[PDB]
Amino acid sequence: NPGFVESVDEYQFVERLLPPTKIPEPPKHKHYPTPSGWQPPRDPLPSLPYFVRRSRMHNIPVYKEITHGNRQMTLIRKVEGDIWALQKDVEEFLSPLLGKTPITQVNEVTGTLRIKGYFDEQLKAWLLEKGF
Amino acid sequence: AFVRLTLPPPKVVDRWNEKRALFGVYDNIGILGNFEKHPKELIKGPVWLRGWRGNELQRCVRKKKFVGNRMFIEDLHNLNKRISYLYKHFNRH
Amino acid sequence: YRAPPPPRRRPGPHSPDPENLLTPRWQLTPRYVAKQFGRHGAISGVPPASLWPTPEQLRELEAEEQEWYPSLATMQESLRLQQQALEARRQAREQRI
Amino acid sequence: DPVLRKCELRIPVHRRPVQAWVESLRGFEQERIGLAELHPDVFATAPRLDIVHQVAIWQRNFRRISYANTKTRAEVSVAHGPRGPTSYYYMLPMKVRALGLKVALTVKLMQDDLHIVDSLELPTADPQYLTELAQYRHWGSSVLLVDLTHEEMPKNVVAATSGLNSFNLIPAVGLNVYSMLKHQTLVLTLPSVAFLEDKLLWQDSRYTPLYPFR
Amino acid sequence: GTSLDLLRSLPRVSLANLKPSPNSRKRERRPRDRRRGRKHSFRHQYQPLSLRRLQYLIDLGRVDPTQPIDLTQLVNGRGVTIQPLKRDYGVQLVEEGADTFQAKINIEVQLASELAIAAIEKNGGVVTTAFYDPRSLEILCKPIPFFLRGQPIPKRMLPPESLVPYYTDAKNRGYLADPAKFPEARLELAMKFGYVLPDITKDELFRMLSARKDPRQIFFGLAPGWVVNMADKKILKPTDENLLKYYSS
């Protein structure tokens, strides 16, 4: 006489508890931007020579970085296409706001651009205008 | 000094032999095997350093613990004396 | 040349030999037997009824529960006593000051 | 009837698919029988050869164990000589290792050193036929043959590849950067390409592993 | 991509061609020549989840809106990082993000802010607090491992007398709170903000939202003392009367 009875009815909870391995794609929303502020990449995408892809989390690949404890920096990594064209536009956009030509170093090997100072907010808004 | 008056015998090396040609195969067992077996599991050598690395003192200490029950009395005593000298240098100087 | 067959870990339950001197003690414990059931369940062959505590084990657990783990009613009484002590302390402070 | 293959996963919209000529080993002139599509995120990655360089060093030096030893003055019946067995094992990041394999695939394809084949089956097991076909198709001196699983690999290929020093046959799980670099040209079966893409494309997302997957 | 055009023209690379990346390796000094010749535990380690952090999870669909918010689902969704070695004992929220988090959903958190409770209730969500033992919570986060061990589902523990007042408090919305006060309490919270109280009963999914497990019950799906047929992907229920006495004890 077994001391246990087996039923499949309540196993639905166990199935739910199973761990996921791949992040699901964001769900479609009736109205954009989302109340938090998230908005998927603008459509149609821009036809510029350089394409900036979103992160795996579908976020803008802009990171604020500080080195030596005194040098504020912002880095764009997922740049596809002509990095030089992006730098020219970035230099033009930031020169008025910054008040002078921004000081930047281009790492073409890694396809990354480093800019002194924190300007992610303005660039992130500007990137949205480009349609990325 | 004085040097050899004759050349050493010629050596021929086969770069496409089975060992060299197939060296490294299955090194991607983890990614290509669903990570069921970690590549560290493919390390062949002394038991106390399979999948582990450390400095000489750590290696010697790990060796003593792993095979201390199988270590010779003469070897165990010698290892202890060597460890004593090593311990003072690293942990006091 | 053709590469050798890929290395594969053997699946399925494996029972260590209790008599063997080399086998470690912890691999012969009931926890190891319970581990075998968890991995393969029925394929392990461990009777599920054995997994539950034995009657002698049950009695020990009951004593521990009563001895160290208070019930809600006991907890509620303790709160009332602490409140009464706190109430007395408040009254003592007021009259003193 | 052309053999047409499409990427199972969704290719990025901004990236067009990569394509290559499907081949068969049944006949000498069966060079082209179909056209297949390759995921750009796998076969059109950036040419970052330093990762390939690092992977090669990691592959060679993670198995390295040196048994050189010398006795010090206290052990004499070398002041700074080798002391006992030494290990050089280290682990590169999982993401980097996957990227290194991806970079190698692009290099072979862009350099016309990768040959996609429907199946490895051969009309005969004679090693002469395999070598001659490589000459006809202008393959490199060393050709690497990859199959999905070791158990199901054709018998005819095994006899020829086993007896050929410069033509080596390995299973899909055994693929590595070192062999691809060591071998002039790479031969990949269609199922192997799908098998490789899944693991490489699966790497997306993190959901960090709270415990080993063993 | 003109870079690809460079790749196709270039000849096949070889093993010897491999070269270390610039600046990858620094120089090393060796004595070969004259160069180197000569010379709090008792207090729960509450881990908060911000309302702004809460909002994006709903926005991204990381946690299913239909399913009530559950700590395990957050663990499954990697919302927060909990280390048993850190011995985290509590879960709470961050006051930040009140005005960027407009959503209503049923949720249970070990600790909830009094102000936050009303705001989500104002939206229409249902919030309560339950006590999970730190050892039990670690088991809860990782259900599969104890199944491998063979351990059965135990009864959920209760808070120590130090934390009993918090859970028993009606305003705290703990499972130890008196249900009779909840109708009165819910109205009071509505008046505090002044918003018109939306009755939970009106909601179509009221029973799903309002469902709560027993204090002894760790899992709403699985009653305490239960067993799971992991091999058969099924749930096993003990049929021994003495086991019921064991659970009663």
B45 touches chain D (CB under 8 A): yes
| Location of structure tokens 């030509």 | A101
The SS3 call for residue E239 is: coil
Chains near C with 3+ CB pairs less than 8 A apart are: A, B, D, E
- Is D12 in CB contact (< 8 Å) with chain E? no
Q: Which of E1, E61, E237 sits opposite A4 (nearest CB)?
A: E237
d(CA C4, CA D170) in angstroms, rounded, equals 8
Rounded CA gap, C93 and B14, in Å? 97
Provide CB contacts within 8 A for D30, sequence distance 6+: D23, D24
Mutate to test the interface with C, among A4, A6, A14 (most CBs of C within 10 A): A4
Helix or strand holding residue A52 (H, E): strand A51-52
Chosen for mutation from C2, C8, C10, C39 (greatest number of chain D CBs closer than 10 Å) is C2
Number of Cβ pairs < 8 A linking chain D and chain E: 46
The CA distance from D205 to the nearest CA of chain A, in Å, is: 6
Q: How far is Cα E168 from Cα E165, in angstroms, rounded to an integer? A: 5
3-state secondary structure chain D: CCEEECCCCCCCCCCCCEEEEEECCCCCCCCCCEEEEECHHHHCCCCCHHHHHHHHHHHHHHCCEECCCCCCHHHCCCCCCCCCCEECCCCCCHHHHHHHHHHHHHHHHHCCCEEEECCCCCCCCCHHHHHHHHHHCCCCCCEEEEECCCCCCCHHHHHHHHCCCCEEEEEHHHCCHHHHHHCCEEEEEHHHHHHHHHHHHHCCCCCCCCCCCC
Å between E35 CA and nearest CA of chain D? 17
| Spatial CB neighbours of D16, under 8 Å, sequence gap ≥ 6 | D40
- E219 dihedral zone (left: phi>0; alpha: psi -120 to 50; beta): beta
Give how far C34 is from chain A: nearest CA, Å.
16
Q: Do A127 and A121 meet the contact criterion of CB atoms below 8 Å apart?
A: no
Give me the residue label for tokens 């392990």: C44
Nearest Cα residue in chain E from A35: E100
Would an 8 Å CB–CB cutoff place E34 in contact with chain D?
no
Most distant pair of Cα atoms in chain C: their distance = 100
| Residue in B30, B42, B49 nearest the CB of D87 | B49
Q: Compute the distance between CA of residue D186 and CA of residue D196 in angstroms, rounded to an integer.
A: 14
Question: For residue E240, what are its two tokens?
Answer: 């021994």
A65 bridge partner residues: A73
Which chain E positions have a beta carbon within 8 Å of C48's beta carbon?
Answer: 227, 236
Residues 156-195, chain D, touching E (beta carbon < 8 A): 178, 181-182, 184
SS3 A123: helix
Phi/psi-derived region of residue A117, left when phi > 0, alpha when psi is between -120 and 50, beta in every other case: left
Q: Looking at this protein, which amino acid is placed at residue A95?
A: S
State whether D89 and B60 contact (CB < 8 Å): no
Q: For this experimental structure, what is the resolution in angstroms?
A: 5.7
**Set of chain A residues whose Cβ sits within 8 Å of the Cβ of E229:** 6
CA neighbours closer than 13 Å in the CB half-sphere of residue A30: 0
Which method was used? Answer: cryo-EM
In chain C, what residues touch D171 (CB-CB under 8 Å)? 3, 6
Radius of gyration of chain E (CA): 27
> Which residues have a Cβ under 8 Å from the Cβ of E181 and sit 6 or more positions away?
E170
Residues 27-56 of D with CB under 8 A from A: 46
Return the SS3 of B59. Answer: helix
Across the interface, do D74 and B85 touch by the CB < 8 Å criterion? Answer: yes
Instruction: List residues of B whose CB lies inside 8 A of any C CB.
Output: 18, 21-22, 25-26, 29, 33, 36-37, 42
How far apart CA E155 and CA E226 sit, in angstroms, is 9
Could you tell me if D189 and D119 are in contact, meaning their C-beta atoms sit under 8 angstroms apart? yes
Pairing of strands A4-7, E234-238: antiparallel
| Alpha carbon distance D174, D197 (integer Å) | 15
- Say if residue C55 is preceded by a cis peptide, omega within 30 of 0: no
Cα angle for residues C18, C24, C30 (degrees, 5° grid): 60
Q: Which of D201, C23, C11, D175 is nearest to B37 (CA)?
A: C11
- Measured in whole angstroms, how far is the alpha carbon of residue A53 from the centre of its chain? 8
Residue B52 contacts by C-beta under 8 Å, 6 or more apart in sequence?
B62
Q: Which residues numbered 92-131 in D keep a CB inside 8 Å of some CB on C?
A: none
Element (H, E) at B84: helix B73-92
Cβ-Cβ contacts under 8 Å, E243 against chain C: 52
A to D contact (≥3 Cβ pairs closer than 8 Å): yes
Q: How many angstroms separate the CA of residue D43 from the nearest CA in chain C?
A: 25
- Which amino acid appears at position E38 of this protein? R
Residue D170 tokens, joined: 């390995």
Strand partners, E69: E107
Beta strand pairing call for E107-108 and E127-128:
parallel
Contact criterion met (CB < 8 Å) for E233 and A11: yes
- Placement of tokens 């023209």 in the chain: E9
B21: chain C residues, CB-CB within 8 Å: 1
For chain B, say whether C3 makes contact (Cβ under 8 Å).
yes
| Residue showing tokens 């049944």 | D26
Contact list, E235 vs chain A (CB under 8 Å): 6-8, 10-11, 14
A94, amino acid identity = L
Mutate to test the interface with D, among A18, A21, A107 (most CBs of D within 10 A): A21
Interchain CB contact of A21 with E (< 8 Å): no
Give residue C30's identity as a one-letter amino acid code: P
Inter-CA distances, A1 with C48, D210, E226, E233, Å: 11, 39, 18, 22
Three-class DSSP category at A114: strand
Q: State the amino acid at position D172 in one-letter form.
A: A
Return the ∠ at Cα A17 (arms to A15 and A23), rounded to 5°. 100
Residues 6+ apart with CB under 8 A from D193: D36, D38, D116
Would you state the torsion angle of the CA atoms of residues E49, E52, E56, E58, taken in this order, to the nearest 10 degrees? 70
E35, HSE (Cβ side, Cα atoms, 13 Å): 6
Closest chain B residue by Cα to residue C8? B37
> Which C positions 12-71 lie with beta carbon below 8 A of chain A?
48-49, 52
Residue of chain E whose Cα is closest to the Cα of D50: E21
Residues in chain C within 8 Å Cβ distance of A4: 48-49
Q: Inter-chain contact E221–A37, Cβ cutoff 8 Å?
A: no
* Cβ contact E12–D184 (<8 Å): yes
Nearest 5°: CA angle at E129, between E123 and E130?
A: 145
Cβ neighbours of residue B63 under 8 Å, at least 6 residues apart? Answer: B46, B48, B49, B79
User: Chains with ≥3 Cβ pairs under 8 A against B?
Assistant: C, D
Q: What is the gyration radius of the CA atoms in chain C, in angstroms?
A: 29
For the stretch C69-77, contacts whose Cβ atoms lie closer than 8 Å and that sit 24 or more positions apart, written own/partner, are: C70/E161, C72/E158, C75/E161, C75/E164
Query: How many angstroms separate the CA atoms of D143 and D161, rounded?
Result: 10
